[PDB]
Design a protein around this ligand. Structure first.
Ligand SMILES: S=C=Nc1ccc2oc(C3=NCCN3)cc2c1
Ligand SMILES: S=C=Nc1ccc2oc(C3=NCCN3)cc2c1
Length: 575
């Protein structure tokens, strides 16, 4: 028989192959950093220094023949292509008329972006997240943010994945007009300019490739030379752990919506929709797309954008077009892909889209039932309440009243039920609506007791400015605090108030607050009681389930309450 191939490990890239090439020590244009191949090019060098070399080689993976070719003397390079990622025991055999001889087996890795080469992720979840057996039909969603790995120090293996059905990954930008991103300060706008160098406008990119795929996480067993790293390799390894988990990129958001206003021109939608198909072929762990345009008709971060007449028809077309695209991917892959969107729920946002037409294309609508009130002005109110609070005036709830100056309210007040009912009344199915819960508070200072028109209700006061605090307190920007900061700095363990805050609850709105009467610090948020009330409301109306913004800011209490409030419930999944 021929001499047995001896595999040259260092001559064959120590048997590490990747279907994706990712730039690792530089930051450039997305199309210069990211190259994906349908088949990996496998090249394995071997030698046969003694004896006869033979005529032909065969490559085996786990005992099955995957490639064959000619022997070239004493040194041969086996070159072939292979589509399926994984870890395999490879053997190379040499054959001639006399017989065949084979190398010892050695493990080959073929990386792919479904995580098929990876073991299930090792988790490191705060043990305050409890276990439940919520019915699998119910959505339990949340947003994980790409930048949460910096100061917030919250990584993929921290998520309580067994308690989630959907992870929306916040956020994928669209190249093009993006002045709103300058409002975050720091390097975010300039990072986007780098990502978009050499990329056509209206195509998606990764905003932060360091966080997405370059940074080595030692808890995920990453090495500097590991071919895929960052949050994306962790999400791949999470999907190996929990294969029924849906991981969906979220396009847009508050700061990254400015390009959507140009989707009134179909040409820009076509560019966008093709890029999203490419994106999902590249990054196979994703299961669909979520569109967070804030908002058709305007009222988002860009004060100079928004077309009430045209943006709704654009949104609907987008959804129509994205669904055609996703149907192509389902044909190509055999997989099921979801199309969703987070939407505003004020009456003036919902009136700009004919959702009866859009929703036919969509699996879920994540109703943004939060940010109703906040530190952008000095008017207290409940930011995430189901119903109208005590603080509201006669006829403010349904919009038929007049304000304190005698001016007509222009529509119903901002509450979760006013927006859910406006969506239902136009024919959006209940079982496609997902109700939002807040893992953060918004707040004010200067709401001192002398400013209240009703002394029992700090939501009848007036502020002097936004809540201020430090990042250790969960205050990453003025007027906004993580729920785990409210719990550590205002509620305490027994939920009865610390540091001069008192707890209160508006039983008519279903909305909690904490109030320090000395500093006039007032914070509106969601707590155990209000999130049980959202679960009971969702069960009562047959909504699809609950989602939350943002998972790093919880300590387990809010996600636990989402599940508790859903106990016993089942729902019909949309077809
Ligand atoms: S690098 C470092 N820190 C970072 C890097 C990127 C970031 O993005 C945000 C942001 N805040 C609201 C929406 N996006 C914060 C933030 C901090
Ligand atoms: S980053 C960013 N985060 C956000 C996310 C949502 C938001 O809503 C507002 C708001 N401003 C006036 C009315 N609503 C600000 C704002 C900032």
């Amino acid at each position: 028989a021929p001499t047995a191939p001896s595999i040259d490990m260092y001559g064959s890239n120590n048997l590490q192959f990747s279907k994706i090439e990712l730039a690792m020590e530089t930051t450039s244009g997305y199309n210069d950093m990211v190259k994906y191949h349908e088949l990996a090019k496998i090249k394995v060098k071997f030698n046969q220094w003694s004896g006869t070399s033979g005529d032909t080689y065969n490559v085996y993976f786990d005992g099955v023949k995957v490639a064959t070719g000619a022997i070239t003397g004493s040194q041969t390079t086996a070159s072939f292509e292979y589509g399926q990622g994984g870890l395999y025991q490879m053997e190379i055999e040499a054959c001639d008329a006399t017989g065949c001889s084979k190398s010892a087996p050695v493990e080959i890795t073929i990386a792919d972006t479904d995580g098929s080469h990876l073991k299930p992720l090792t988790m490191n979840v705060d043990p305050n997240n409890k276990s439940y057996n919520t019915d699998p039909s119910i959505v339990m969603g949340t947003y994980f943010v790409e930048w949460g790995i910096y100061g917030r120090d919250y990584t993929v293996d921290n998520m309580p994945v067994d308690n989630l059905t959907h992870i929306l990954y916040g956020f994928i930008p669209i190249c093009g007009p993006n002045e709103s991103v300058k409002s975050v300060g720091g390097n975010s706008f300039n990072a986007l300019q780098t990502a978009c160098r050499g990329v056509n406008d209206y195509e998606v990119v990764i905003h932060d490739p360091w966080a997405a795929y370059q940074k080595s996480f030692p808890q995920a067993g990453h090495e500097y030379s590991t071919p895929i790293k960052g949050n994306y390799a962790m999400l791949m390894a999470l999907k190996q752990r929990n294969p029924d988990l849906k991981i969906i990129p979220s396009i847009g958001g508050w700061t990254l919506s400015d390009p959507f206003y140009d989707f009134v021109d179909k040409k820009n939608r076509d560019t966008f929709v093709a890029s999203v198909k490419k994106f999902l072929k590249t990054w196979k762990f994703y299961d669909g797309v979520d569109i967070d345009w804030e908002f058709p008709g305007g009222g988002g971060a860009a004060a100079d954008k928004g077309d009430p007449v045209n943006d709704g028809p654009a949104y609907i077309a987008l959804m129509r077009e994205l669904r055609v695209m996703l149907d192509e991917l389902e044909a190509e892959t055999g997989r099921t892909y979801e199309l969703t969107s987070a939407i505003g729920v004020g009456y003036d946002k919902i009136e700009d889209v004919d959702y009866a037409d859009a929703v036919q294309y969509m699996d879920y609508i994540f109703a943004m039932t939060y940010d109703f009130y906040g530190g952008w002005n000095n008017v207290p109110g409940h930011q995430t309440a189901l119903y109208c609070g005590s603080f509201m005036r006669p006829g403010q709830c349904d919009g038929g009243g007049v304000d304190e100056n005698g001016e007509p309210y222009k529509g119903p007040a901002y509450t979760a039920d006013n927006g859910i009912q406006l969506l239902l009344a136009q024919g959006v199915p209940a079982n496609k609506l997902v109700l939002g819960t807040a893992m953060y508070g918004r707040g004010w200072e200067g709401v001192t007791p002398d400013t209240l028109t009703d002394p029992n209700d700090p939501m009848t006061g007036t502020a002097t400015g936004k809540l201020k605090g430090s990042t250790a307190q969960g205050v990453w920007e003025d007027g906004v605090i993580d729920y785990k900061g409210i719990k550590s700095f205002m509620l305490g363990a027994n939920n009865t108030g610390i540091n001069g805050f008192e707890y209160g609850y508006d039983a008519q709105a279903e909305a909690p607050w904490v109030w320090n009467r000395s500093t006039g610090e007032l914070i509106t948020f969601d707590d155990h009681r209000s999130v049980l009330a959202k679960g009971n409301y969702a069960k009562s109306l047959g909504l699809a389930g609950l989602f939350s913004w943002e998972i790093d800011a919880d300590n387990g209490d809010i996600l636990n309450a989402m599940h508790e409030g859903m106990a016993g419930g089942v729902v019909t999944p949309p077809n």
